[PDB]
Each structure stands twice: as C-alpha cells, then as structure tokens.
Design a protein around this ligand. Structure first.
Ligand SMILES: CC(=O)N[C@@H]1[C@@H](O[C@@H]2O[C@H](CO)[C@H](O)[C@H](O[C@]3(C(=O)O)C[C@H](O)[C@@H](NC(C)=O)[C@H]([C@H](O)[C@H](O)CO)O3)[C@H]2O)[C@@H](O)[C@@H](CO)O[C@H]1O
Ligand SMILES: CC(=O)N[C@@H]1[C@@H](O[C@@H]2O[C@H](CO)[C@H](O)[C@H](O[C@]3(C(=O)O)C[C@H](O)[C@@H](NC(C)=O)[C@H]([C@H](O)[C@H](O)CO)O3)[C@H]2O)[C@@H](O)[C@@H](CO)O[C@H]1O
Ligand SMILES: *[C@@H]1O[C@H](CO[C@@H]2O[C@@H](C)[C@@H](O)[C@@H](O)[C@@H]2O)[C@@H](O)[C@H](O)[C@H]1NC(C)=O
Ligand SMILES: *[C@@H]1O[C@H](CO[C@@H]2O[C@@H](C)[C@@H](O)[C@@H](O)[C@@H]2O)[C@@H](O)[C@H](O)[C@H]1NC(C)=O
Ligand SMILES: *[C@@H]1O[C@H](CO)[C@@H](O)[C@H](O)[C@H]1NC(C)=O
Ligand SMILES: *[C@@H]1O[C@H](CO)[C@@H](O)[C@H](O)[C@H]1NC(C)=O
Ligand SMILES: *[C@@H]1O[C@H](CO)[C@@H](O)[C@H](O)[C@H]1NC(C)=O
Ligand SMILES: *[C@@H]1O[C@H](CO)[C@@H](O)[C@H](O)[C@H]1NC(C)=O
Ligand SMILES: *[C@@H]1O[C@H](CO)[C@@H](O)[C@H](O)[C@H]1NC(C)=O
Ligand SMILES: *[C@@H]1O[C@H](CO)[C@@H](O)[C@H](O)[C@H]1NC(C)=O
Ligand SMILES: *[C@@H]1O[C@H](CO)[C@@H](O)[C@H](O)[C@H]1NC(C)=O
Ligand SMILES: *[C@@H]1O[C@H](CO)[C@@H](O)[C@H](O)[C@H]1NC(C)=O
Ligand SMILES: *[C@H]1O[C@H](CO)[C@@H](O)[C@H](O)[C@@H]1O
Ligand SMILES: *[C@H]1O[C@H](CO)[C@@H](O)[C@H](O)[C@@H]1O
Lengths: 484, 484
C-alpha cells in the first residue's frame, strides 16, 4: 500500500503501571529492504529538532527519561511496532510519534500520534437524573491497558446498596481496553450527598488508586418545619414559617381560603403579618410542590383581642309591673365573662359566653336608674351604660306636712312618679283679694317637691289638701300640722 | 270881645231824663242891637243845609223831634243860652250847634259844639290790679246833668263787702257834673268772678238803670288736686297730676331730688312715666309759684316688682362635722317671704325680710345634694340653686359580698365617700400566670361600686379583702360568701 500507520489517538494508565500502545505501519511494497528499523520519538516528531529517544533499533542508548523504562514488542518485519512503557511517571505524559528507517532517505515519521494520559484516579459514571423512586445503575471504568498488571475493582462506601456485578475488559474507542464494574441499587431520599467510592488495586503491588463521587438523587419535598397552633394579638407581628426539604429546588406557596398570598422558590418561606385583624384569623396552609412530588401542612391562626364595647338593645321604658327583657351582646375573640349591675347591687353574671340576658318580671319603682354592662376579659375590658325608667301612679310621701308660722302658713307635699305629676293645692274656703297663694315646685329624681305659702291665714289652721295626677293614677293627702 | 262861645265838648244823661247844656257866647261889643235872638240847630250847623230846629227865638214851631221836648233858660241878653231837653230818647243823640241872630247879616253859628251822649247804664270803675291781700276801693259814677231829676246810687250785690260811702256831685271836665258813690272793701281769693252792681234811680219816677262789673282779683295759687301715695308696677304707665288754682296764670313745676324734670304755665300739669324703674321710686314734689305767692305738695311714689333672682354666697364644700354657713340675699321692692329647701324637706323659712341665713352645725353625709332658694312674693317668684358637697372617710357598706360561681369567683364591695376612693382587692396567696384578676368600678352619687373577678379559683373560697382610701381615712372589710 502507501506509507502510514494505525495507532490509538488517546490512551491512558496509572502511575507505576505499564502501557501497551498497540500499532501497525506500512510502506510501499515496491521496495524490499530487509532489516526494517524504526524509532520512537517522545514529544517531537522530526530529528532536526532533537526529541527524546523512547526506542531506536539496535541502540541501548535512549533518553535518560526512558532508560530501562521502554521496550518494543513484535518483529518490525511483520510491521508490528507496539511499545511498552513500565514504571510510568507524570513526566511521561505526552505525545508519542513513530518513525521508520529502512534504507537511506527512505525515512518516514508517521503523522498519526498517540497521546499518553496518566491518571491517578478511577472513573465513576452517574446518570444526570437520579430519581429516588427509580432503580439507577452506576459504573466504574478503569483503563486496563497494561499487559503486566491486572486491576481489580472494589466498590467502597457502597455499604447497604446492592452488591456489585463484575464485568471484564471492554472495547474502548479503537484499540484500548477498560475494566468496568457495575452497581445496581435504589436510592432513599436521604441518599443525596452520599459519597460513593471505587478502588482499583493490583495483587502483588502496593498500588491503590481511590476515586470518589457524591450522588445527586432527586427527591420530592417533605415539609419538616411547621408551627403548631399560633394564637396571636391584634396589631402584633406574626411570622409564619414553612420549611421544606427537597433536592431539586422546591416551590413554596402560602395559601389561605383558595387565594395566592405569597409564593417563592426557596428552602424556607416567611409570611409576615403586621396589624393583625380578626379577619386574618383562620387556617393557613403551606403547599410545597415539586416536579417529583408534593407535601402540605396547615396551621390554625387565632387572633385574640379584648371584646368590643357591649351593645345593649331591648326595652328602655316600661310601666310598673311590666316585664323588662334586656340582652347585652358582645363579640369577642377570646371568650369572655361579663356582668351587668346597678349601684350597690349586681343583677346577673354569665361566664365564657357571647351574650347575657336580664329579665325583670315585675318592675318596682326602685328599678329606675342607670345600669352598667361590663364585658370583662383577659386582654382588656370595656363597658357600656343603659338607663331603665319606670313609670307609675304618683305616691304622696308621708314626709309631707303643713307648718304654720306666726303670720302665715306654708305647706309642703312630696310625691314620687316618673312622669312628673301636676301638683295642686285645695282648701274649703270664697275668692279673696290677692294676696295670692303661690307655689314653687322643683324636681329631683322621681321626687316632685313643692311648697305652698298661704298668707295672712287666721290662727285657726286651714285644711290644706295636696293632689297630684299623672296618666296612670291620682292621689290626694289631707295634710297634717306640726305645732310648736 | 270877639265872636265865640263856651260849651262842654261831651255831655251825657239817661233815657227819660233831661239834660242841661250850659253855655255862654259873645259878639263884638261894637254893635249894640237890642233883642238878641238865637237858634239851636241839631246835627247840622248852617241854614243852607236844613237842620232840625231845637229852638228858635219867638217861634213855637220847632222840629217834631223836639216839639215840647226843648226849652231855653236865661235871657240871651246876658249872653246865657243854656238849653234843657226833657224826655230824652236814643234819637236825640247827636251834635248840637248854637247860632245867634242879632240884626241882619250879623248871624253867626259858633264853631264849638256839644255832643249829647245818652246812656242807659251807670259807670263802674275798678283799678287794674286787685290783689286779694290788699284793701281796694271801687267807684260808681253817674252823669248828674239834669236839673229836674236827682239820681240816687245803690250798690247791689255788694252783700258782705263794706258799706258804701256816699259822695256828692263832682266837677267833670269843664262844666259837667257826676254823682259818685265809693265802696271800700277787702277781697277773698274767691272774690274773682263775682258780679258787682250799681243802680241809679229817681224818687218819683219808675226809671231804674242797673250796671254790672265782674271783678278780677289776683290771688296766689293753692294746689287743690294732688294724688295720695301712689304705688306702681315697673313698666306700667304712671300719670302724676298737679292741679293749681290761681287767677293769674300759675307757673307749675315738677321736681324731684333738686332737679328740673317738667315745667309749664297751666292750671294742671301731667307727669307721664313709662317703663318705671326702682330708681323712679321716691318722693315727687309739685311746686306752684306765682308773683303773688306759692304752694307745694309731695307724693310718695312706690315702684313694686317681683324680687330679683336670689344670690347665694358662702361655703360650697365642707368636710364632715364642720359648720356650714349659707346666706341667701335678695333685694325686693315689695317685702317678700322666702325659703330654702332640699328634696323631701324644708330647712328654713323667713317672712317679709331681705335675706335668710342657714347654718348647719355638724354636717352629716346626707347633707350633700342640691338645694333651692326661692324668693317668693306677690308680684312674682324667682329661685336660684346651690350645691353643698360634704367630704368624709369612705364607709364600706355591708351590702358587699363574695358570690362564687362554679368555675370562678367574683366579689363586689361598695363604699360611699365624696372624694372618690381608691378601691383595692387583697388576698393571702404567690404570683400566678395571668389569668389576671380584673376589676371594674363605676361611680354614682357618693357610691363607688366595684366588681372583681378572680378566675379558676379552687372550690375552697379564697379570703377576699376590700380596701378603699381617701384623704380623710381608710377602711377594709374582709368580705363574706353567699353559698347556694
Ligand atoms: C515535509 C514536511 O511537512 N516537513 C516539515 C519539516 O521539515 C522536515 O525536516 C526534517 C529534518 O530532518 C526532514 O528533512 C523532513 O523530511 C524527511 C525526514 O527526514 O523526516 C525526509 C524523508 O526522506 C522524507 N520521506 C521520504 C519518503 O523520503 C520524510 C517524510 O516525508 C516526512 O518525515 C513525513 O512527515 O521527511 C522535513 O519534512 C519542518 O519544516 C516542520 C516545521 O517547519 O514542518 C514540516 O511540515
Ligand atoms: C265861611 C265858612 O267857613 N262857611 C262854609 C259854608 O258856607 C256857609 O253857607 C251859609 C249858608 O247860609 C252862609 O252863607 C255862611 O256864611 C254866614 C251864615 O249865614 O252863617 C253869613 C254870616 O253873615 C257870617 N258871619 C258874619 C259875622 O257876617 C256867618 C259866619 O261867618 C259863619 O256862619 C261862621 O261859621 O256865615 C257860609 O259860611 C259851607 O260852604 C260849608 C260846606 O261847604 O263850609 C263852610 O266852611
Ligand atoms: C339587637 O342587637 C343584637 C346584637 O347586636 C349585634 O351584635 C352586636 C355584638 C353588635 O355587633 C351590634 O352592632 C350588632 O347589631 C342582636 O343579636 C339582636 O338580635 C338584636 N335584636 C333586637 C333589636 O333586639
Ligand atoms: C355675699 O354677697 C351678699 C349679697 O350680694 C349682694 O346683694 C345681692 C342682693 C345681689 O345684689 C348681689 O349682686 C350683691 O353682690 C353680701 O350682702 C354679703 O356681704 C357678701 N359677703 C360674702 C361674700 O359672703
Ligand atoms: C503485535 O504484537 C503484540 C504483542 O506481541 C500483539 O499483542 C499484537 O496482536 C501484535 N499485532 C499484530 C501481530 O498485528
Ligand atoms: C414558628 O416557628 C419558627 C421556627 O421554625 C419561629 O421562629 C416562629 O417564631 C414561630 N411562629 C410563631 C408565631 O411563634
Ligand atoms: C395537600 O396535598 C394533597 C395531595 O398530597 C391534596 O389532595 C390536597 O388538596 C392538598 N391540600 C391543600 C390545602 O393544598
Ligand atoms: C341616666 O340617667 C342619669 C340620671 O340618674 C343621667 O345622669 C344619665 O346621663 C342617664 N344616662 C343615659 C344613657 O340616659
Ligand atoms: C245861665 O242860666 C242857667 C239857668 O238859669 C244858670 O244855671 C247859669 O248859671 C247861667 N249862667 C250865667 C248867668 O252865666
Ligand atoms: C292721680 O289723680 C288723678 C285725678 O286727679 C287721676 O286721674 C290719676 O290716675 C291719679 N294717679 C294715679 C297714679 O292713680
Ligand atoms: C315749699 O314751700 C315752702 C314755702 O311755702 C318752702 O319753704 C319749701 O322749701 C318748699 N318746698 C319745696 C319742696 O319746694
Ligand atoms: C348639683 O349636683 C347635681 C348632682 O346631684 C347636678 O345634677 C347639678 O347640676 C349640680 N348643680 C350645681 C349648681 O352644681
Ligand atoms: C509514501 O510516501 C508518500 C506518502 O503519501 C506517497 O508517495 C506514497 O503514499 C508512499 O507510499
Ligand atoms: C267876629 O267875627 C270874626 C270872627 O273871628 C272876627 O271878625 C271878629 O272876631 C268878630 O268879633
């Protein structure tokens, strides 16, 4: 054929082991020179620029960087120029050209070259996506290009994961071999961040090459941080925390009542509430969702505040004996105990209830007066006042009398009634020049107090009769005298 | 001498009597004709214009208006041509010329003529000013020019006035006589407007001639119309009347307090007062003054109106047992009876006095309350209100108790005091999580009503002790319980 050569492009082995660069070459058959000679140049391809001599036919003298480090396999007559390099060092990493020298001027450095890689760590392969719920296999590939040493693979750190299935050397690229050992297992959610190792060693040697890899198994989110039932005060500051554990980024969503609120892709998400209202009260849910699953939790938020000022509706005015129904109603976030009461006495009390009802079957006059409803509670108390008035027929009090002075007589009669009664004075006497009797009447509470003055009345005290009328009834007391 | 004649200018007598026109004439002595003749022409002086012939020598034929009515006295030889005309009538009033006819062409009508007045009424003379206090004389003159009849004068209507002093005939002007009768008297104030008369009559005849005159005696003013003590209402209308009796115009002057007010020259003078004030009250004097005297009277004017609203000054605040002095003072035009009083009781009363004083030696708490001072009176009543407050050490009322409910206990203690006392609750227990006790305290009158609620207290009722402090004192009641 024509000039040329076959050689692997890339080839590799470990520090301290050998390599075996396989090859083959060709020259024009047209020439028949016996004793085919060749040379192996490191780094550089042509003689002009002196390269290190890896091998040269019928010369023990080579580069000191290969002395006792190189040897050729195969008769070059059969065009077989495979080269072995024992005891490798990082220095020996480089490109290796091959050149042939048959006869004179028939010398050719072949353009195809192999590049020698020297690694000190094995190769662990892992698929891009490693879902937790799915079986996933991983391999371990080590360049078995050495005829003198035979690597054996050992999964370390595999622990509880399934046992390794060993495989032999396999064809890599064109003309290079590699020993592979597989590993079949299933990953827990936790498995992410676990360090998995593969070790290659050689039976008689002290050579051991370890190599690590940390897995990245994807798992759905599990909400691990969530508040218990939160009970907060109005206007206070409320921080809700939703934590989530997921390998892929999780999406966090705060929701309540079918609404959006706050949403973010993070490991934890705060919901800050300022100026808290009873409308903020309710159950809040945090939803965590990932393409690989989801999880959600709820928390009951309870807003607590002192009850509002009580509202009292019912009956304000009522005649005697009628039945007065009064209810005192107040909404409160924390259940509260409340009570209503007049001065000097407490009418009714209810405990931990929304509203209290007071009923007075028959109403005496003493029921007239202002009342108080207090909505007592842990977080504060507010009250409200309501008045209850009671109407009745006027009652002329026996505190009434006719005191006479030396020249004139004057009388006082007091009655009580809620509708202020028409006071009047009568006396059996005819009409006189005036000298007109004149009364004055001031009112305080239910009491109508009125004082008459009859002037120039004879020493014999005149019968004075007091009468007062309201809508409901009438009364008339013939007044007494208080001499000396 | 020369031609000429003497004759009275004016001369008069009554209807029905005679006249006696005296005369005398003269002609040039140079001529000596015997048998001097003359004529008396009425009205006209010369013959050309025919006049009535009163007399003509040696002719019985005269004017028919003088036939048997005329006659001549004295020989014309002695130049005496006096003429008498009996039975006079109003017709015979006129001028009378005299003319002489001695010889031919020696005829002369003398330029001097007498005019005959005929009156039917006497002449009464009165001085211009007739002061009442002064003696004043009046005369009565009657023309005594008749030789045949002799008038006699008689004062009629003179009555109580001094008797008349008769006088004889007196020389009037030149050649006429008049009978005068005087009258000496003194005039009362009343005498003005009195009719005084003088009558002349003749003994044998039926002829009587009366003549009157009404006197105008000046007298000082005497105030005869004057009001008694006038007692009037404010804003009413007041008419003061001052009447005065005087012949000359009197000057009327209304005065008070040394001031002018109203002044007028009249018989009566009104002082009208509208919108009467207590400042109008006082004594008003009416002065009457005339150049001939003066008189004056006074009237007390009293303005009456309901008392003003009472003013109460003194002490409003006072501790227990202290003495409270309060006075209620009110000015009033009509004296009024007033009184002060609380509800249901009347403290004090005074009658017909300007002010009333109330004193409360020791002040109990029940003295706290509003008081009324009413200034009662005939013409209206007004009042005023004053409050009296009384401070004292708080008194914890035995209406207080500790009522327990099934889950919680609540206590009520009421105290009374005017300075609102600091209520407090104590109990022998250490500090607990809260669950904080909470009290409510409303105030009404002197009563501080307060209710505690102690929550979750064990079935065994805890000792509750109520304490209240004011400036004056402190009290503490260990409260009781009311089971079932
Ligand atoms: C041709 C070429 O691309 N070479 C360039 C380089 O120059 C080389 O220099 C060396 C120095 O000894 C040689 O002269 C070489 O030619 C020879 C050799 O000795 O390798 C002569 C041989 O006889 C000849 N072949 C045959 C069949 O006779 C060989 C052979 O053709 C080549 O080696 C094949 O690669 O070549 C010169 O080629 C030098 O200029 C470098 C850098 O500039 O560039 C090369 O392209
Ligand atoms: C002079 C005179 O003022 N007279 C005026 C009037 O005229 C008279 O008319 C009468 C008519 O008879 C006489 O003519 C009068 O004269 C006499 C008489 O007869 O009275 C004539 C007498 O002789 C003569 N006196 C003497 C001494 O002789 C008298 C005598 O002198 C007067 O009487 C004296 O008063 O007069 C006329 O005088 C006549 O015109 C009236 C109206 O117009 O006015 C007279 O002034
Ligand atoms: C009277 O009103 C009662 C309660 O009033 C309502 O509730 C209170 C807490 C406040 O919110 C107030 O504003 C509300 O109006 C009712 O429950 C009751 O049925 C009503 N009925 C009447 C008029 O007696
Ligand atoms: C308090 O005042 C008394 C009276 O007040 C006066 O008289 C009354 C009628 C009203 O006219 C009022 O305007 C006047 O001021 C005094 O008489 C008394 O002296 C006073 N003394 C006090 C202050 O106690
Ligand atoms: C070249 O020699 C090597 C070592 O003897 C051998 O492995 C390879 O098969 C040979 N190649 C040939 C003969 O083509
Ligand atoms: C909820 O829990 C977080 C810790 O995970 C805490 O910081 C926060 O205060 C809690 N929320 C409330 C309202 O206490
Ligand atoms: C929580 O997730 C479940 C499924 O895991 C879903 O059925 C449910 O509706 C979710 N709840 C909320 C409030 O999102
Ligand atoms: C109730 O009546 C009292 C009088 O005793 C009065 O002071 C108060 O203002 C009244 N309150 C209402 C709400 O009517
Ligand atoms: C005129 O005569 C009368 C009457 O005889 C007489 O009164 C008067 O004195 C006589 N006058 C004389 C004479 O002068
Ligand atoms: C005073 O008296 C007159 C009558 O002389 C009378 O008209 C008037 O009304 C009186 N005045 C009063 C105030 O009565
Ligand atoms: C009244 O008149 C007398 C004299 O008649 C006099 O002294 C007195 O001052 C007068 N009074 C008045 C108030 O004018
Ligand atoms: C007096 O006190 C009463 C309360 O009992 C009040 O209603 C009234 O307005 C007070 N009056 C004065 C003048 O202070
Ligand atoms: C080798 O030398 C050159 C390389 O192409 C050619 O002349 C021929 O292929 C020969 O075999
Ligand atoms: C009368 O006549 C006239 C009047 O004066 C005069 O001549 C004389 O006075 C005589 O006596």
């Amino acid at each position: 054929g024509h000039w040329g050569a076959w050689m692997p492009s890339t080839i590799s082995a470990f520090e301290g082991t050998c390599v075996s660069i396989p090859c083959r070459f060709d020259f024009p058959d047209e020439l028949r020179p016996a004793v085919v000679h060749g040379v192996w140049y490191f780094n550089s391809p042509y003689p002009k620029n002196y390269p290190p001599v890896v091998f040269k036919s019928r010369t023990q003298v080579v580069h000191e960087s290969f002395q006792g480090r190189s040897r050729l396999l195969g008769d070059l007559g059969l065009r077989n120029c495979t080269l072995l390099l024992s005891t490798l060092s990082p220095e020996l990493g480089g490109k290796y050209y091959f050149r042939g020298d048959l006869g004179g001027y028939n010398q050719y450095t072949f353009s195809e070259h192999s590049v020698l890689d020297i690694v000190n760590t094995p190769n662990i392969v892992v698929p891009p996506e490693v879902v937790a719920g799915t079986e996933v296999e991983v391999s371990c590939m080590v360049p078995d290009n050495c005829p003198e040493l035979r690597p054996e693979l050992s999964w370390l750190g595999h622990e509880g994961l399934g046992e390794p299935t060993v495989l032999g050397r396999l064809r890599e690229d064109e003309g290079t071999w590699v020993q592979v050992s597989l590993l079949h297992f299933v990953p827990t959610r936790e498995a992410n961040g676990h360090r998995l190792g593969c070790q290659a060693a050689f039976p008689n040697t002290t050579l051991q090459f370890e190599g690590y890899a940390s897995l990245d198994v994807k798992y759905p989110p599990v909400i691990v941080e969530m508040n218990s039932s939160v009970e907060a005060i109005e206007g206070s500051h409320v921080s809700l925390l939703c934590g989530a554990d997921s390998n892929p980024p999780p999406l966090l969503t705060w929701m309540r009542d079918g609404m959006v609120l706050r949403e973010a892709v993070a490991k934890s998400l705060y919901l800050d509430l300022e100026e808290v209202t009873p409308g903020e009260d309710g159950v809040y849910a945090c939803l965590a969702e990932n393409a690989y699953g989801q999880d959600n939790r709820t928390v009951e938020l309870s807003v607590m505040y002192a009850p509002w000022k009580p509202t009292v509706n019912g009956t304000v005015v009522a005649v005697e004996g009628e039945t007065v129904s009064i209810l005192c109603s107040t909404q409160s976030n924390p259940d509260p105990i409340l009570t209503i009461f007049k001065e000097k006495q407490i009418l009714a009390t209810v405990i931990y209830e929304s509203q209290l009802q007071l009923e007075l079957p028959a109403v005496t006059p003493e029921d007239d007066g202002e009342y108080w409803c207090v909505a007592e509670n842990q977080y504060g108390q507010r009250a409200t006042a309501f008045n209850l008035s009671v109407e009745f027929a006027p009652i002329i009090l026996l505190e009434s009398h006719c005191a006479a002075a030396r020249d004139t007589v004057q009388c006082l009669c007091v009655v009580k009634s809620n509708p202020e009664p028409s006071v009047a004075f009568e006396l059996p006497s005819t009409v006189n020049e005036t000298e007109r009797e004149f009364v004055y009447s001031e009112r305080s509470g239910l009491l109508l107090t009125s004082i008459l003055t009859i002037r120039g009345q004879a020493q014999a005290p005149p019968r004075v009769i007091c009468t007062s009328r309201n809508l409901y009834g009438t009364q008339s007391l013939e007044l007494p005298f208080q001499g000396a």
